[PDB]
């Protein structure tokens with residue numbers, strides 16, 4: 001009955017990944033003008049970087065509670081789940097993710113943060129959610145190219161994987177999962193590869209074009225969303 005215990009009960013169902021319980025508890029709160037409880041749960045999930053926040057939102061979305069997602073989460077959730085054209089902006093550098101024009105053979109086009117363009121159709125992507133085994137994963141489609149962001153099999157001397165945009169998806173290498181974070185008033189996301197569980201990042205090495213190559217990073221990112229996380233802007 002009191003709001004804090006309703007908040008705890010909601011948070012706890014999501015923590016244990018009982019999303020059907022989270023959804024039902026949420027539709028109840030929402031119908032009763034207790035969006036406060038729901039918003040507070042999301043804020044809490046996000047402060048603690050709980051990945052399960054993503055599955056919660058997606059289940060609300062699939063179970064006819066798109067309103068809750070729109071009204072009680074960071075705008076980025078609606079942007080992600082409505083598959084709106086968005087820009088992927090790396091917080092550390094304020095560069096937009098894009099693809100090259102020429103191909104890298106079978107791996108496809110090279111993915112990088114562009115030194116100059118953060119506004120043309122080139123920098124436009126969409127998230128395409130999918131559900132498997134109680135998780136939400138995303139394909140990340142370059143809209144100008146109709147190519148999917150992927151990690152290549154190869155690694156650098158650090159064990160980092162190059163990122164590319166390719167035609168097909170018979171590999172978890174083309175799938176990603178998200179973990180929300182905060183920094184100031186900014187909601188951000190670590191974007192991890194399903195195959196390698198490495199976070200999508202931009203290289204600290206600058207190309208002379210001002211471009212920075214995109215990589216699945218072999219290292220710890222957590223705790224530092226201002227260096228390793230992404231923001232999602234309406235395009």
Ligand SMILES: [K+]
Nearest residue numbers: 019020021063
């Ligand atoms: K169910």
Ligand SMILES: [K+]
Nearest residue numbers: 001028029032
């Ligand atoms: K009630």
Ligand SMILES: [Pt+2]
Nearest residue numbers: 033034035036
């Ligand atoms: Pt209210």
Ligand SMILES: [Pt+2]
Nearest residue numbers: 103104105106
């Ligand atoms: Pt190549």
Ligand SMILES: [Pt+2]
Nearest residue numbers: 110112207213
């Ligand atoms: Pt390059």
